[PDB]
Design a protein around this nucleic acid. Structure first.
Ligand SMILES: Nc1ncnc2c1ncn2[C@H]1CC[C@@H](COP(=O)(O)OP(=O)(O)OP(=O)(O)O)O1
Ligand SMILES: [Mg+2]
Ligand SMILES: [Mg+2]
Ligand SMILES: [Mg+2]
Lengths: 105, 667
DNA sequence: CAGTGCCTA
DNA sequence: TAGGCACTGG
């Protein structure tokens, strides 16, 4: 149930969407990214209807990330009705992630 | 014979004060120090040695001490002081001749760590004296809680400077006697520290006399400088910069930016195995942070620090990254794990996307535009950075910087200005010209005389094979232009391509590449040309047999008798011909100037002509009038014929002269 | 400071 | 198959 974004769809899928959307900026060559990926798949299913999990591979879609000043990956950006509400960088555990979501949702 | 050295407040261009000087006199064996108020006496002593028909030894005195003293005598004492060329010896000039196989720092201008090979000890010390004196000065200041200002060690005379002056003469004396002990250049039966100047030049090897005349003349060439069109180069810069910007705009739209790992400190380890993962980008593990905590990090939650990078057309790494992504599969790599990315391979790179394929051409245009901007304006050695107040560029010349006897040029290198046939070469070349110098009296621009030795090394080849073919080649050469005659046969595009061919050949793939074909054509041409001239093999053999046997002798005897170091058995023929060419040209420019002077012409901007540049076998001479330019051209041809006769050359030597306003028109 | 690549003859 | 020098990346 993960939404795979692209530079051209990001605006309407994330910024113009309704409800909370968690965006994961990642790269295939990042160890930490590969670590949290599995966790994100589980969150997506667990938080159905209460949250939307999206992913943007910065190598295939190079235009978006810079606009948000990315300096490290994975970068978890939470958008609420068009804007960033919270942000966390690094390979959080499922537990740490659930906390981040619950507390922020 | 006396040995001397001086300490002054600045480089020749802006020197205004004589601080001190030291003289060692062989006839008394004593050292005499001269302090600032002793300047008059210092000069008197030098002219006294000249009155005795004596000799004056300086280390690098031809480019500095001698010119500096003429300048300082006029400014400080309103005195006319001009040491005759024939009374001066230069141990740097000597070392560069005897130890032609070694590099030097060019008196501290070059960092010794960067130079390859060993360095002669005495000359090394002499070249490092300024830097050492500076270090002493600084520490001595900081020792007194005083601050140091760059170059203040040279503003005033002090006993520390005095002591270094004495040390320079002691070391120079030692260097001198070490050079004089080389029996190949100086007959052991003569004590050269105890003879008059006339004897010194006539009894020592010809090379000794030739190198001193060359250094004296080239030192003059440096002071003349090459008139330079500053305004034209600034306008060129503006044009190149805008095109650079436009190419960058187009390229950064075609090849978007990306992210790269950067700043990672820790090693990424498999979260389950613990297995270190060296290949993976380095990560960073935050120590502080938690889930309300507004911070974006969480202790123990690792992430890969990265950086945003924009496509840099000057980066071979970036070029290589985008082209492979576009489907390019390199064929040739560097002997260090990296795909070769030069203009030649770029020209052959094919990809599917038409826009990216077309961008390859923009990349090549961009690299080239950068080469011109760098050389003309932005590089550390850029022309715009070197033009002096007099409106000229005074490039330096090491008269004997190459092992073969050729000279080297730097600061900036005026022997590497883009040719007229290359992109923007006409503007570059046109900026260097006699027309850019306005006569000091009439305000009228000077005119340029450019003379180039014709088919020089092919004629040197003819000379050396004459004892194998009795002069057939030398004779065949003076039957039209050899290079044009080559181009035709080789079916080559340009007369330059024919030159680069014949010289690559004389000294299969490389041949084919230069000719534009493959190893097959290179081979065919290599044979068709060798079979045409078989005596070339005999000359090679004879050379090999004389040097190799593990060396039998690792040097070849140059036209003036000096030893010419041979680096490898394969480069032997080239060494022999390039040295012959270099030495022919060297005596040639010396004789040309001597003849102009015997004709009553004055050398200088305040005279009739001025040597502006010497690029191996061509000279560019600034002339006050067209008539003088004509005399310079005809005289250069006569000097060449004189050189050919002087060394009994087996092939007639010639020159080609052109009169014009600048280098674009005179070469 | 080293690896590459271009400028000249 | 003699040299100088610029630009990138560590
Ligand atoms: N690519 C090269 N490789 C080796 N030596 C070269 C090369 N180009 C030139 N030389 C040497 C041999 C000739 C000498 C002077 O250069 P130049 O090109 O003027 O000689 P040239 O005799 O070919 O031409 P010209 O007859 O037009 O003066 O420098
Ligand atoms: Mg000195
Ligand atoms: Mg020539
Ligand atoms: Mg030439």
């Amino acid at each position: 149930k993960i939404i795979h974004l692209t530079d051209d769809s990001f605006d309407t899928d994330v910024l113009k969407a309704d409800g909370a959307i968690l965006v994961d900026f990642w790269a295939e060559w990042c160890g930490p990214c590969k670590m949290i990926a599995p966790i994100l798949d589980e969150i997506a299913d667990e938080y159905q209807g209460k949250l939307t999990v999206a992913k943007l591979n910065i190598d295939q879609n190079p235009g978006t990330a810079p606009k948000y000043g990315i300096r490290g990956i994975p970068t978890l950006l939470l958008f609420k009705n068009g804007e960033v509400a919270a942000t966390k960088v690094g390979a959080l555990s499922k537990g740490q992630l659930k906390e981040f979501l619950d507390a922020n949702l | 014979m006396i040995v001397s050295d001086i300490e002054a407040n600045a480089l020749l261009e802006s020197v205004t004060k004589f601080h001190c000087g030291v003289i060692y006199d062989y006839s008394t064996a004593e050292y005499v120090s001269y302090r600032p108020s002793d300047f008059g006496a210092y000069l008197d002593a030098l002219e006294a040695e000249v009155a005795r028909g004596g000799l004056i030894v300086f280390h690098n005195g031809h480019k500095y001490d001698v010119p500096a003293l003429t300048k300082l005598a006029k400014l400080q004492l309103n005195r006319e002081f001009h040491l005759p060329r024939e009374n001066c010896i230069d141990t740097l000039v000597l070392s560069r001749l005897i130890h032609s196989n070694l590099k030097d720092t060019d008196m501290g201008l070059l960092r010794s760590g960067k130079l390859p090979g060993a360095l002669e000890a005495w000359g090394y010390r002499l070249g490092e004296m300024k830097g050492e004196y500076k270090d002493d000065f600084k520490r001595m200041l900081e020792e007194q809680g005083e601050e140091y200002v760059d170059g203040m060690e040279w503003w005033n005379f002090n006993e520390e400077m005095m002591d270094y002056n004495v040390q320079d003469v002691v070391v120079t004396k030692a260097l001198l006697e070490k050079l004089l002990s080389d029996k190949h250049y100086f007959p052991p039966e003569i004590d050269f520290t105890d003879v008059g100047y006339t004897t010194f030049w006539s009894e020592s090897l010809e090379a000794v006399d030739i190198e001193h005349r060359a250094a004296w003349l080239l030192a003059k060439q440096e002071r003349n400088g090459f008139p330079f069109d500053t305004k034209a180069i600034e306008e060129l810069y503006v044009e190149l910069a805008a095109r650079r910007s436009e190419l960058l705009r187009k390229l950064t739209e075609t090849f978007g930016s990306w992210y790269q790992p950067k700043g990672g400190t820790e090693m990424f380890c498999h979260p389950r195995t613990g297995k270190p993962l060296p290949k993976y980008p380095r990560i960073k593990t935050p120590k502080v942070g938690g889930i309300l905590d507004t911070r974006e990090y969480v202790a123990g939650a690792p992430y890969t620090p990265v950086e945003h990078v924009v496509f840099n057309p000057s980066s071979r790494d970036h070029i290589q990254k985008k082209l492979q992504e576009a489907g390019w599969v390199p064929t040739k790599y560097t002997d260090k794990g990296a795909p070769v990315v030069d203009d030649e391979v770029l020209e052959g790179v094919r990809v599917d996307d038409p826009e990216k394929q077309a961008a390859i051409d923009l990349i090549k245009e961009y690299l080239m535009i950068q080469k011109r901007i760098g050389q003309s304006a932005e590089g550390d050695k850029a022309w715009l950075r070197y033009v002096a107040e007099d409106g000229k560029i005074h490039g330096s010349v090491n008269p004997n910087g190459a092992v073969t006897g050729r000279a080297t040029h730097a600061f900036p290198n005026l022997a590497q200005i883009p040719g007229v046939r290359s992109p923007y070469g006409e503007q570059c070349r046109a900026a260097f010209g006699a027309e850019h110098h306005l006569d000091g009296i009439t305000g009228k621009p000077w005119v340029q005389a450019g003379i180039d030795a014709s088919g020089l090394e092919l004629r040197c080849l003819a000379h050396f094979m004459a004892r194998f073919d009795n002069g057939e080649y030398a004779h065949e050469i003076l039957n039209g232009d050899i290079h044009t005659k080559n181009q035709i046969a080789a079916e080559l595009p340009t007369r330059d391509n024919a030159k680069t061919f014949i010289y690559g050949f004389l000294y299969d793939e490389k041949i084919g590449q230069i000719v534009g074909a493959g190893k097959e054509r290179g081979k065919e041409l290599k044979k068709k040309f060798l079979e045409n001239t078989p005596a070339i093999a005999a000359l090679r053999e004879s050379i090999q047999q004389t040097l190799v046997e593990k060396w039998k002798r690792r040097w070849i005897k140059g036209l003036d008798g000096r030893k010419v170091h041979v680096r490898s058995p394969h480069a032997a023929l080239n060494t022999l011909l390039q040295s012959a060419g270099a030495l022919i040209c060297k005596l040639w420019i010396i004789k040309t100037e001597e003849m102009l002077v015997e004709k009553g012409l004055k050398h200088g901007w305040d005279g009739d002509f001025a040597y502006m540049a010497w690029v191996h076998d061509e000279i560019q001479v600034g002339c006050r009038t067209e008539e003088i330019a004509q005399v310079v051209i005809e005289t250069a041809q006569e000097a060449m014929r004189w050189v050919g006769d002087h060394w009994n050359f087996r092939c007639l030597l010639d020159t080609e002269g052109k009169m014009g306003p600048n280098w674009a028109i005179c070469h």
